[PDB]
């Protein structure tokens, strides 16, 4: 809750002003990433995120 709307309730002034985003009847659209799980022979292990930046670090930590 914005602190502006807290002042609606806690000792409000006669002239009480807030800013609001006009959204009408719109609903929020949360997006999910695409997640690819890779299983390869390269309970305690985990799916470690891999990308172009950390590829060599993951190779080293696997240490083939």
């Amino acid at each position: 809750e914005s602190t502006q709307h807290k002042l609606d309730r806690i000792r409000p002034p006669r002239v009480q002003i807030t800013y609001d985003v006009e959204t009408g009847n719109a609903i929020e659209k949360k997006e999910l990433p695409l997640v690819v799980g890779i299983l390869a022979d390269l309970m305690e292990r985990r799916f470690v995120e891999i990308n172009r930046d950390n590829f060599n670090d993951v190779l080293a930590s696997i240490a083939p």
Partner: protein, 365 residues
């Protein structure tokens, strides 16, 4: 070779995937035997390490990002433990709505190498063998629609042959990066093109004719087909291992067939993930049956494209041509509901039978 092929296949996928806020690759270092042991020795199906890591920790946890897809750098033959592992993996994949992609072994076809793939007169005859009873049973199972097997190997036994599952995964990740959805992953122009292959000799171990590709598609495989005299190969088909059931109505047959296609199964799985997340966010809010139905139909409307004349690149961005959500109450249980989500995708060209006729006058259509 085998280790190098895995690492190089992985490196190519990572380097060619636009990873970022919207796209993540997560890697689990595990052998085929370890997977088999974990899945077989689990006290219950939901107790295996794979089930925990794939279903519970992401799809079944508040704030998780569900696995959209699983790629296994393994080959599966006709051996009983291979089919058993495929079945257990299909169960985990189905639970999490995360289709699984791996490679078909040449031993599945009673072949030493896929260089022999053009030798048999009839491929379907091979799969009548008593050694393939378990494979046919697996194809009959519901959860087999979450398993796809690709063939043959792709050039990266003196040549470095890699799993073609890496190439199909790359097609999927490119489709997501360009369009936000993974339907456009097949054909010359529909996203199935694997370009820039080494040209030394088929870069895909064997030439696959149109008739042979169709046979393989009918048998539950996704074949990579080299374009002759080029550095290019194409996934023409996108069929899962599931064998659709045959019914007495056109609607049921059509629905069974498309529910065995990898692009559509991927889209349906994505909608399962979205529904899980958004409805978990709605638990505890004041909602009637009608509130739930209105919210879900409003939410899904943004993914629907009515225009069937839109170009390929536009249709690739919208997984649905029609959708509808029906919600019903459960008697005696306030706030408990059941829903059915009907998804009608944009369909991809599969077959064309043409008759050419010379005529002195054009007959009416």
């Amino acid at each position: 070779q085998k280790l190098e092929a895995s690492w190089r296949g992985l490196h190519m996928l990572v380097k060619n995937t636009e990873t970022g806020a919207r796209l993540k690759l997560r890697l689990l270092n595990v052998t085929q035997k370890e997977l088999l042991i974990d899945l077989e020795k689990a006290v219950e199906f939901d107790q295996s390490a794979l089930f925990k890591k794939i279903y519970e920790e992401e799809y079944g946890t508040f704030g998780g990002h569900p696995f959209s897809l699983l790629v296994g750098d393994y080959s599966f033959g006709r051996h009983p433990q291979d089919i058993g592992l495929l079945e257990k993996l299909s169960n985990v994949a189905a639970a999490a709505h995360a289709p699984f992609i791996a490679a078909a072994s040449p031993r599945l076809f009673d072949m030493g190498s896929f260089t022999e793939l053009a030798v048999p007169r009839d491929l379907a005859k091979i799969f009548e063998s008593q050694e393939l009873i378990k494979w046919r049973a697996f194809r009959e199972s519901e959860d087999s629609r979450y398993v796809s097997l690709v063939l043959p190997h792709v050039l990266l036994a003196r040549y470095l042959w890699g799993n073609a599952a890496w190439a199909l995964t790359q097609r999927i990740t490119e489709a997501f990066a360009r369009y936000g959805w993974c339907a456009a992953i097949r054909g010359v122009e529909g996203g199935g093109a694997v370009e820039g292959l080494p040209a030394h000799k088929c870069p895909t171990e064997v030439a696959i004719t149109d008739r042979r590709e169709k046979e393989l598609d009918a048998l539950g495989f996704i074949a990579l087909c080299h374009k002759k005299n080029s550095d290019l190969a194409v996934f023409f088909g996108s069929q899962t291992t599931n064998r659709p059931r045959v019914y007495n109505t056109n609607e049921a047959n059509a629905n069974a067939r498309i529910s065995a296609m990898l692009p559509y199964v991927l889209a349906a799985s994505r909608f399962a993930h979205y529904l899980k997340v958004i409805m978990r966010d709605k638990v505890g809010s004041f909602m009637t049956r009608d509130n739930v139905q209105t919210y879900l139909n409003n939410w899904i409307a943004d993914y629907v494209l009515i225009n069937d004349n839109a170009p390929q690149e536009i249709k690739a961005q919208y997984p649905l041509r029609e959708a509808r959500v029906d919600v019903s109450e459960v008697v005696g249980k306030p706030g408990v509901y059941r829903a059915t989500v009907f998804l009608r995708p944009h369909f991809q060209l599969e077959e064309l039978t043409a008759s050419i006729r010379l005529v002195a006058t054009l007959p009416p259509p």
